[PDB]
Scaffold this active site. Structure first.
Site, PDB file in Angstrom:
ATOM      1  CG  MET A  71      -0.907   2.355 -17.443  1.00  0.00           C
ATOM      2  SD  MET A  71      -1.135   0.575 -17.570  1.00  0.00           S
ATOM      3  CE  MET A  71       0.264  -0.013 -16.613  1.00  0.00           C
ATOM      4  CB  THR A 106       1.181   9.126 -32.587  1.00  0.00           C
ATOM      5  OG1 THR A 106       0.957   7.947 -33.369  1.00  0.00           O
ATOM      6  CG2 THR A 106       2.677   9.272 -32.313  1.00  0.00           C
ATOM      7  NE  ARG A 118      -3.167  10.864 -22.280  1.00  0.00           N
ATOM      8  CZ  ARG A 118      -3.165  12.185 -22.114  1.00  0.00           C
ATOM      9  NH1 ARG A 118      -4.230  12.805 -21.621  1.00  0.00           N
ATOM     10  NH2 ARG A 118      -2.092  12.890 -22.450  1.00  0.00           N
ATOM     11  CB  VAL A 119      -2.113   2.998 -22.464  1.00  0.00           C
ATOM     12  CG1 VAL A 119      -2.334   1.739 -21.636  1.00  0.00           C
ATOM     13  CG2 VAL A 119      -2.087   2.653 -23.945  1.00  0.00           C
ATOM     14  CE  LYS A 149      -4.038   1.047 -28.688  1.00  0.00           C
ATOM     15  NZ  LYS A 149      -2.916   0.530 -29.517  1.00  0.00           N
ATOM     16  CG  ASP A 188       6.018   0.237 -35.219  1.00  0.00           C
ATOM     17  OD1 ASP A 188       7.159   0.657 -35.516  1.00  0.00           O
ATOM     18  OD2 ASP A 188       5.208   0.904 -34.542  1.00  0.00           O
TER      19      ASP A 188
HETATM   20  N1  LIG Z   1      -0.579  -3.319 -21.905  1.00  0.00           N
HETATM   21  C1  LIG Z   1       0.100  -2.194 -21.577  1.00  0.00           C
HETATM   22  N2  LIG Z   1       0.558  -1.998 -20.318  1.00  0.00           N
HETATM   23  C2  LIG Z   1       1.238  -0.882 -19.976  1.00  0.00           C
HETATM   24  N3  LIG Z   1       1.511   0.118 -20.839  1.00  0.00           N
HETATM   25  C3  LIG Z   1       1.110   0.052 -22.137  1.00  0.00           C
HETATM   26  C4  LIG Z   1       0.364  -1.135 -22.585  1.00  0.00           C
HETATM   27  N4  LIG Z   1       0.090  -0.948 -23.887  1.00  0.00           N
HETATM   28  C5  LIG Z   1       0.613   0.251 -24.244  1.00  0.00           C
HETATM   29  N5  LIG Z   1       1.224   0.849 -23.201  1.00  0.00           N
HETATM   30  C6  LIG Z   1       1.903   2.171 -23.223  1.00  0.00           C
HETATM   31  O1  LIG Z   1       1.173   3.074 -24.059  1.00  0.00           O
HETATM   32  C7  LIG Z   1       1.956   3.473 -25.186  1.00  0.00           C
HETATM   33  C8  LIG Z   1       1.095   3.471 -26.437  1.00  0.00           C
HETATM   34  O2  LIG Z   1       0.729   2.142 -26.805  1.00  0.00           O
HETATM   35  P1  LIG Z   1       0.455   1.831 -28.357  1.00  0.00           P
HETATM   36  O3  LIG Z   1      -0.413   0.599 -28.471  1.00  0.00           O
HETATM   37  O4  LIG Z   1       1.796   1.883 -29.046  1.00  0.00           O
HETATM   38  O5  LIG Z   1      -0.417   3.132 -28.753  1.00  0.00           O
HETATM   39  P2  LIG Z   1      -0.739   3.638 -30.250  1.00  0.00           P
HETATM   40  O6  LIG Z   1      -0.773   5.142 -30.144  1.00  0.00           O
HETATM   41  O7  LIG Z   1      -1.996   2.928 -30.690  1.00  0.00           O
HETATM   42  N6  LIG Z   1       0.542   3.202 -31.360  1.00  0.00           N
HETATM   43  P3  LIG Z   1       1.957   4.221 -31.531  1.00  0.00           P
HETATM   44  O8  LIG Z   1       1.453   5.549 -32.046  1.00  0.00           O
HETATM   45  O9  LIG Z   1       2.828   3.491 -32.522  1.00  0.00           O
HETATM   46  O10 LIG Z   1       2.538   4.301 -30.139  1.00  0.00           O
HETATM   47  C9  LIG Z   1       3.120   2.497 -25.258  1.00  0.00           C
HETATM   48  O11 LIG Z   1       4.295   3.111 -25.798  1.00  0.00           O
HETATM   49  C10 LIG Z   1       3.297   2.048 -23.821  1.00  0.00           C
HETATM   50  O12 LIG Z   1       4.181   2.934 -23.131  1.00  0.00           O
END
Ligand SMILES: Nc1ncnc2c1ncn2[C@@H]1O[C@H](COP(=O)(O)OP(=O)(O)NP(=O)(O)O)[C@@H](O)[C@H]1O
Length: 341
Positions: A24, A28, A31-32, A47, A143
């Site tokens: 999805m 950083t 990976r979702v 995630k 953020d």
């Molecule tokens: N519930 C969701 N449904 C669909 N896509 C999602 C969802 N949550 C996150 N994503 C995608 O996955 C990406 C990463 O999510 P995020 O929670 O920001 O990851 P992170 O690495 O923990 N934090 P960051 O490093 O600031 O992006 C996001 O930019 C979205 O594109």
């Protein structure tokens, strides 16, 4: 690189429950992946956080913060639904509801043109419901950006509409989404009122003046970021296109207002000292610039009223984009503004 993220394949079976379908999005830290649970057939966004131990620890804090703000509102107060966590060997996995693309991605699809003002109004109402809730929970997101605001509809239903572009009045086509509902994501750096407050918060371009000037911050810092988001939803581009604090600060004076004399004074006592001309009590600009291009860039910056053509939205935005954090309105007050009626 994104190769550093969890290696997956379609048909993977995580924790004897989740069937991996596709990716999805990538951050950083995590990976979702879109997954279907084999017991209930329901769909989830999983995630998968990277192997590293420090990212595992922060993910646990993230899980903890997310758990505290889960509620029983119909739209979960526009906060991403979090269902729980599990370990996949060395990987921390957080279970979310599946959501659509970010508001940033939609801007990208629309050729970096802004949303129609009618749609902005509705996104704005929905983001404010979430921020008003976080205020009541005494939580600062830290953020806020269009990348962290996702469309509630995972199917991304849309159609082409004709709009006069804000800049030149040229008739162009953009996508309007069917759903106007949104969800806030990415609560990793989120900080409760009683918790420890870091020196630097926010994504650089959405960073509050009091953060840059090291004057201390609270929940009102989220409000500055919100104003940058809204400006971007309107123009399709960043309000502050910059990569260094000094330039960032000089841009704030050119676009919004001069920095209050009291804030510049309090900055001389903190780590914001290197930005202030101590004697004249003003920004050390253009003295502390890094190049002539940086100066030309700040000079090319139009004030906000030349950028925001809509009168009520301009007034609305100036209320939010107050350099003094104490003068910024709360989400509850903004919901009463004439623009949102
Ligand atoms: N519930 C969701 N449904 C669909 N896509 C999602 C969802 N949550 C996150 N994503 C995608 O996955 C990406 C990463 O999510 P995020 O929670 O920001 O990851 P992170 O690495 O923990 N934090 P960051 O490093 O600031 O992006 C996001 O930019 C979205 O594109």
């Amino acid at each position: 690189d994104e190769i550093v993220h969890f290696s997956w394949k379609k048909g993977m079976l995580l924790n004897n429950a989740f069937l991996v379908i596709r990716k999805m999005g990538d951050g950083t830290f995590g990976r979702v992946l879109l997954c279907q649970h084999i017991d209930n057939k329901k769909y989830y966004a999983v995630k998968v956080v990277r192997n590293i131990k420090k990212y595992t620890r922060s993910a646990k804090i993230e899980a903890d913060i997310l758990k505290k703000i889960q509620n029983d509102d119909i739209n979960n107060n526009n906060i991403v639904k979090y269902h729980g966590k599990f370990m996949y060997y060395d990987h921390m996995c957080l279970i979310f509801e599946p959501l659509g693309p970010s508001l940033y991605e939609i801007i990208t699809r629309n050729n970096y043109n802004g949303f129609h003002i009618e749609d902005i109004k509705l996104y704005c109402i929905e983001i404010l419901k979430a921020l008003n809730y976080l205020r009541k929970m005494s939580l600062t997101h830290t953020d806020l950006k269009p990348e962290n605001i996702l469309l509630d509809d995972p199917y991304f239903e849309k159609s082409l509409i004709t709009v006069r572009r804000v800049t030149d009045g040229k008739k162009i086509q953009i996508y309007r989404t069917k759903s106007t509902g949104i969800k806030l994501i990415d609560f990793g750096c989120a900080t409760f009122k009683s918790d420890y407050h870091g020196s630097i918060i926010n994504t650089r371009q959405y960073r509050a003046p009091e953060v840059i000037l090291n004057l201390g911050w609270d929940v009102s810092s989220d409000m500055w970021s919100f104003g940058c988001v809204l400006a971007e939803l309107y123009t399709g581009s960043l309000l502050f296109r910059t990569h260094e604090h000094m330039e960032h600060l000089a841009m704030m004076e050119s676009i919004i207002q001069p920095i209050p004399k009291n804030m510049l004074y309090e900055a001389t006592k903190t780590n914001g000292s290197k930005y202030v001309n101590k004697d004249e009590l003003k920004l050390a600009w253009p003295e502390n610039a890094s190049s002539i291009n940086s100066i030309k860039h700040v000079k090319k910056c139009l004030p906000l009223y030349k950028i925001i053509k809509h009168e009520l939205f301009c007034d609305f935005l100036y209320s939010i984009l107050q350099i003094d954090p104490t003068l910024r309105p709360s989400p509850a007050e903004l919901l009463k503004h004439k623009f949102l009626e």
